[PDB]
Amino acid sequence: EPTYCLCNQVSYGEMIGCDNDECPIEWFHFSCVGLNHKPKGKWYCPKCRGE
């Protein structure tokens, strides 16, 4: 039922959470943010990183 990411699709595969506690979206599919493996350290989504 719930949707996430910038694509507004249901959760699938590995999801990564924006480290900005105020991020409106928070969770993104690895694929939608160009990831294939969990990155070390803090991670911020494109919008929060200023894309």
Partner: peptide, 8 residues
Amino acid sequence: ARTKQTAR
């Protein structure tokens, strides 16, 4: 980073 696997 914080990540989680989709679960049914």
